[PDB]
Amino acid sequence: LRNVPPIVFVQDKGNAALAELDQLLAVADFGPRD
RNA sequence: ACAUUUAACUAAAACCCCUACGCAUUUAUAUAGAGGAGACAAGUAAGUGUACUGGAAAGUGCACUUGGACG
Ligand SMILES: [Mg+2]
Q: How much distance in Å is there from the Cα of A3 to the middle of ligand 1? A: 26
- What is the CA A13 to C1' B39 distance in angstroms? 68
Q: What CA–CA distance (Å, rounded) separates A34 from A20?
A: 22
* Resolution, Å (one decimal): 2.8
Burial A16-33 (b: 16+ CB within 10 A, else e): eeeeeeeeeeeeeeeeee
Q: How much distance in Å is there from the Cα of A32 to the middle of ligand 1? A: 84
Q: What CA–CA distance (Å, rounded) separates A20 from A14?
A: 11
User: Which chain A residues in 1-34 sit with Cβ < 7 A of strand B?
Assistant: 1-3, 6-8
Q: What CA–CA distance (Å, rounded) separates A26 from A21?
A: 8
The experimental technique used to determine this model is: cryo-EM
How far is the first Cα of chain A from the last one, in angstroms, to the nearest whole number? 53
A21 phi/psi in degrees, rounded to 5: -65, -40
Q: What CA–CA distance (Å, rounded) separates A26 from A24?
A: 5
Kindly state the DSSP code that residue A21 receives in the 8-state scheme. Answer: H
